Design a protein around this ligand. Structure first.
Ligand SMILES: Cc1cc2nc3c(=O)[nH]c(=O)nc-3n(C[C@H](O)[C@H](O)[C@H](O)COP(=O)(O)OP(=O)(O)OC[C@H]3O[C@@H](n4cnc5c(N)ncnc54)[C@H](O)[C@@H]3O)c2cc1C
Ligand SMILES: O=C(O)[C@@H]1CCCO1
Length: 493
């Protein structure tokens, strides 16, 4: 028999969406004054973000001409090309007298170097080489260094601005015993390096490491409890003891949903190690896109109480959504372990944030998001009288820095003065594929905030719309609250 909290997690695994969403709504709802302040802040953040270098303003002037002289696009370009040429005439008199007398982003790929389709048909082995090269080219912006020494030697610039770091030695899903052993050695090496760089700064101000359980056990995806405890656990314990010796945070990343249960069993055992008594540097990620998330929080609150520590909890939405949907459709079970509409995940995240903020003695919440509304909502939900150890934000390298440039830093310089920990992937091209693919899915999805904010045609108010209000609007149109995505039927259907 499971504990009361562990049993509740199990029962919520694939809860119908109507039910799960309906239950979250009032926990996610911001009180009117808070909601109004969250909106104003969210709008302001998104406005400064979108309109650094005057993007909307420039797009506006371009429309106004392209509207006036009833011109098309390509005409506008042609007109600008001429205008540029006329402006290169050194003397104004001379100038005035002269006057009066599949392949979507092929453009962006161009700055690097129909008619395209045929061109592709020809050369099609070069595909395998194309894929590897496009991976490196696109993945570079997301990587902080090839080695941990390199990544760490780049830390000062933002750390002196009040940013923090969590380093990730890229690579996951070890296939062989040898692979897992190599990941173990890489993590150990990394902890020594990060710990020496940290130099006693501690789990809050100083850098930490993020690890993947799938890297530390071969074929983790189908591994049984007994072997995981016998082989993976002693490794997890050894790394955590080493992190503690250097007093740095060690965070257990969250991966596929069918590994949630075993990861909790590992965390449970870890928190009761005598050598970790009184130390609060253990971190654990929870994914708000799962129906189980609020139930996992109740479990974690009880675990912190029983094991007498403050847990570092990273609340995220989740990185594996596309694969989770595909997996559930293959398994043919009674439902999905994740929500099927993005706005429901948003609602879940806010309800979960409130739960975490209510227990500051038990949990240090780490709010990972690139979404300006989510950030503004958490900022208001955390209440008056911020203190640094209350919570932090987190962001991925290559995605979060512009938004967080408005957040981390001095109030005098126009910032919110809230700390942000940057997640810093470290590795060579051989380790990059899986992480890169997830970033493509995140950045390229039309439901993603980072995709929607780039679209100067989507009004700011829509971009930062309250998710609870959005869910009620759907419910009034559709006939009940929390209906699944119309294009994502149940697996058995
Ligand atoms: C520092 C950091 C660490 C992270 N660590 C982890 C981790 O260990 N494990 C992990 O799984 N994730 C992790 N993530 C989250 C993941 O990588 C994405 O960055 C995150 O989900 C983006 O959320 P958002 O608030 O930035 O963006 P938003 O655009 O607000 O939200 C996007 C998210 O919505 C969800 N979503 C998209 N479509 C749908 C849909 N149709 N139905 C329901 N939900 C949908 C997905 O979770 C998607 O990522 C981490 C993120 C950060 C910043
Ligand atoms: O790997 C990923 O895509 C997420 C983001 C960071 C850790 O888990």
């Amino acid at each position: 028999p499971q504990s009361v909290s562990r049993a509740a997690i199990t029962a919520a695994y694939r809860r119908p969406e109507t039910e799960a969403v309906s239950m979250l709504l009032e926990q996610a709802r911001l009180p009117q004054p808070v909601a109004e302040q969250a909106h104003k802040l969210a709008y302001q953040l998104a406005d400064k973000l979108r309109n650094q270098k005057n993007a909307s303003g420039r797009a506006g002037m371009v429309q106004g001409l392209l509207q006036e002289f009833s011109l098309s696009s390509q005409e506008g370009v042609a007109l600008m090309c001429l205008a540029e040429a006329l402006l290169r005439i050194p003397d104004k008199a001379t100038r005035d007298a002269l006057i009066r007398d599949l392949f979507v982003n092929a453009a962006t790929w161009g700055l690097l170097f129909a008619s395209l389709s045929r061109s592709l048909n020809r050369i099609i082995p070069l595909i395998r080489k194309g894929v590897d090269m496009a991976m490196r080219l696109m993945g570079e912006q997301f990587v902080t260094g090839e080695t941990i020494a390199e990544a760490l030697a780049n830390a000062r610039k933002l750390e002196e601005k009040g940013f923090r770091y969590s380093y990730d030695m890229l690579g996951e899903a070890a296939l062989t015993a040898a692979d897992a052993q190599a990941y173990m050695v890489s993590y150990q090496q990394a902890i020594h390096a990060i710990g020496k760089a940290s130099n006693g700064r501690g789990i809050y101000e100083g850098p930490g490491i993020s690890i993947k359980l799938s890297a530390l056990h071969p074929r983790y995806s189908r591994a049984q409890y007994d072997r995981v405890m016998e082989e993976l656990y002693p490794r997890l314990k050894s790394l955590t003891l080493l992190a503690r010796q250097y007093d740095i945070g060690i965070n257990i990343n969250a991966e596929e949903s069918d590994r949630l249960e075993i990861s909790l069993d590992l965390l449970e055992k870890l928190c009761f190690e005598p050598e970790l008594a009184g130390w609060n540097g253990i971190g654990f990620v929870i994914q708000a896109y799962q129906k189980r998330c609020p139930l996992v929080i109740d479990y974690l609150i009880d675990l912190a109480t029983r094991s007498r520590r403050r847990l570092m909890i990273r609340l995220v939405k989740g990185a594996y959504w596309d694969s989770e949907i595909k997996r559930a459709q293959m398994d043919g079970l009674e439902g999905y372990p994740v929500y099927t509409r993005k706005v429901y995940t948003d609602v879940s995240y806010l309800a979960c944030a409130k739960k975490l903020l209510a227990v500051p003695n038990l949990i240090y919440p780490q709010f990972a998001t690139h979404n300006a509304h989510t950030l503004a909502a958490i900022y208001q939900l955390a209440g008056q009288n911020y203190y640094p150890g209350q919570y932090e934000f987190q962001c991925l390298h290559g995605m979060g820095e512009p938004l967080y440039e408005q957040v981390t830093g001095k109030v005098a310089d126009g910032k919110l003065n809230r700390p942000c920990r940057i997640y810093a992937p470290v590795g060579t091209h051989e380790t990059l594929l899986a992480y890169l693919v997830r970033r493509l899915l995140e950045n390229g999805a039309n439901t993603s905030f980072v995709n929607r904010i780039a679209d100067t045609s989507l009004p700011l108010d829509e971009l930062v719309a309250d998710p609870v209000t959005a869910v009620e609007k759907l419910a009034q149109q559709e006939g009940q609250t929390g209906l699944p995505h119309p294009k994502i039927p149940l697996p058995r259907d």
